[PDB]
Every structure is written in C-alpha cells, then in structure tokens.
C-alpha cells in the first residue's frame, strides 16, 4: 500500500489539565492494516517529533497504540473535511484539511466532547508550516 | 470482503417508474457512502445521488433532483433507487457502489455493484 | 454545485508516450479525487483515490497527483492496454460526488 494523507490538528480537549505551535500531521497506511501519524509540536522552546503507530482492529476506524494501553476512535465529522480522534486520560482531537480555524468543526466538535464527558473548554492550536524553536 | 448485488435488467415503458436494488452482504453501508450512478449507452458516468451517514441525509445531484428516490433498509442490507417519469433517455445502465471513505486514511476498498440495464420502450 | 473539467476532452497518443490528464475543479476540493479507467462495454476501475493514492493492483505507471482545484493523471508511459476513457470524480464522504466529463486517450494516426 504506503499510501499517505496529510491534516492538521486544530483543536484538542480531555477529561483533565499544551502546544505553542503545531505542524501539519502526515498519516502513512502500511500494508498490514496499520496507521503512523506524525506530527511536530513547539512545547517549552523546544521542537518534539511525535510519532505514533495505530494498530488494526477488526473494527473499522479503532486502533490500538502505545503497547496496547490506548485505544483511539477516529471518525468523520459532519462538517466537511474534518475528522474527530478519540483517545482512553481520554482525549478528543479535531483534525481538517484546512490550517484556518472552522466554526462549524468547532462547535460540533464541542458537542462530541460533552457527549464523551470531556473538559469543553476546548483547546485551539496555533498552526506553523516549520517549527521554529 | 464486501459485495454488492443489484436486481436484474428492466423493461420499463415511457411514463413507468424502476426501482432497482443493491443488496449487500459481507458488510453493511452504516458508515459508508451508498451512491448511484448511471451511465447512458455510449456516453459518460454521471453521479445521481447517494445515502451520506455523516451528515445523515440522502443527497442527489441538481439533474435527478425531485425524480430519483434513494433509499435503503437496514434490516435487509438493501439500498434502492427509484426514477420516475421515465423516458427514452433513461435507457442506461445504473450502478450502485459503497465508498470507503470512512477511515481517515485507507486502502481504496470501493465496492461497485455488476450494474443494472434499464430499457425504456413499450 | 461543483463541476469538475477535463480538458483536453481527448488525447491521441502511442504505446511509448508519456499521458497526463487533467481534471479542474470548480472551487477548492481538497484531496477528495479518484480517478477511473473505463473502456467500451466494461466497468469502471478505480486507479486512483485521495488525489494520490493507488488502488490495490494498479500498476506504478499511474500517478495522481494534486490538491485545491488542479488534479492530473499521469501515466509515465503508455501500454497497449492504457487505451480507454478516464474519469475523475469527487469521492469523500460528503457530497457532492460528481464526476468529470471524461478523457479518452486514442491512438494516433
């Protein structure tokens, strides 16, 4: 397979207590079923490459990663080009084809949160192409 | 491994209506795009409309509009369409066909029904 | 609506030729491009999903490639069997999934 697929992480939120500055996250499909995502995040000064490798499930849109220990829901939004990840600390994310902020994504994206019981003040991530130290 | 099987070919008279199926079996379409489309002999494919579970409504192209009806039964695992009013022109082939568009990304596993002749003439 | 162009609407070339196709997307679409062969009297076959993603099978002479508007089909050289019409269309999971007018790559002569 080794096909591919790029977004951006626009917002975040959990069920307990952060980024300056985000790139674009590339997803890679591997012939097996698996996903690896990468992202690279600006924290305390300092650039941090985060890869995480999401394992098949025999259901589509869940994976496992982190040994096991974390399962993740991945799902479309209603609003066009954005997708919601679901994470159990459990965490939800809102990932679009477009860096600019949509209100639409934004507020069903509230609404998922407070269906998963998650902290609805939500998080919203400044986006930059290179991550400047 | 998902598959799709319509109903077979139609006469229909100018005036009738047709409703052709789509059942599926090996899966279902609660995630995914159900969609029709025809193509007239000779000429090019043209998207009618489709069943979208994301935004929850069933959508048709401005053409099809207010003479196609997309439906389909949970129970049964069966997707229809319906056009009314036909005419010579409607004489086509019409496919159905589940998209895998639900997975952020994946492998392109797009499942076509093998299509349904429908002949317009008395 | 959304309309998606396919200019030239016709293409004469030879085993051997590069071939790239284009298809124009009204307004801004994203990624969300397939590409199909057809030839006379068969079935569509999906090439290309996501813009630039293979299907499964598909030789490596078919490239997509594109984002926003402006999306080809490039098919590094010609085989034979390469000859039939190519179609682009929406594919995502919201409408609309409209398809192009069509390509058909003949022969020269």
């Known amino acids: 397979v080794a096909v591919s697929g790029k977004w951006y992480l626009k917002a975040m939120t959990a069920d307990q207590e952060k980024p300056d500055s985000v790139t674009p996250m590339i997803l890679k499909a591997q012939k097996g079923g698996n996903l690896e995502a990468k992202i690279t995040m600006l924290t305390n000064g300092q650039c941090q490459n985060i890869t995480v490798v999401l394992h098949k499930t025999s259901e589509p849109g869940k994976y496992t990663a982190y040994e096991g220990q974390r399962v993740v829901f991945i799902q479309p939004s209603p609003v066009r080009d954005h997708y919601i990840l679901y994470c159990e600390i459990r965490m939800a994310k809102l990932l679009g084809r477009d860096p600019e902020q949509s209100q639409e994504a934004l507020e069903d994206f509230r609404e998922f949160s407070r269906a998963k019981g998650l902290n609805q003040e939500i998080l919203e991530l400044a986006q930059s192409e290179t991550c400047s130290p | 491994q998902v598959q799709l099987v319509q109903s077979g070919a139609e006469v229909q008279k100018p005036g009738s209506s047709v409703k052709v199926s789509c059942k599926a079996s090996?899966?279902?379409?609660?995630?995914?795009?159900l969609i029709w489309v025809r193509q007239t002999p000779g000429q090019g494919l043209e998207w009618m409309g489709g069943?979208?579970?994301?935004?929850?409504?069933?959508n048709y192209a401005e053409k099809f509009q207010g003479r196609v009806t997309i439906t389909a039964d949970e129970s049964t695992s069966t997707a229809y369409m319906e056009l009314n009013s036909l005419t010579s022109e409607d004489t086509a082939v019409y496919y159905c066909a589940r998209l895998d568009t639900y997975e952020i990304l994946g492998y392109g596993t797009d499942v076509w029904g093998q299509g349904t002749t429908v002949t317009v003439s008395s | 609506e959304i309309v998606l162009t396919q200019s030239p609407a016709t293409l004469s070339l030879s085993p051997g030729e590069r071939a790239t196709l284009s298809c124009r997307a009204s307004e801004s679409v994203s990624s969300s491009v397939a590409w199909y062969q057809q030839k006379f009297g068969q079935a569509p076959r999906l090439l290309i999903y996501d813009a630039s993603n293979r299907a499964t099978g598909i030789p490596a002479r078919f490239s997509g490639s594109g984002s926003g508007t402006d999306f080809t089909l490039t098919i590094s050289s010609l085989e034979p069997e390469d000859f039939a019409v190519y179609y682009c269309?929406?594919?995502?999971?919201?409408?609309?999934?409209?398809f192009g007018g069509g390509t058909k790559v003949q022969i020269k002569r």
């Open positions: 069943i979208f579970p994301v935004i929850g409504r069933t």
């Open positions: 269309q929406l594919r995502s999971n919201w409408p609309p999934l409209t």
């Open positions: 090996g899966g279902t379409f609660s995630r995914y795009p």
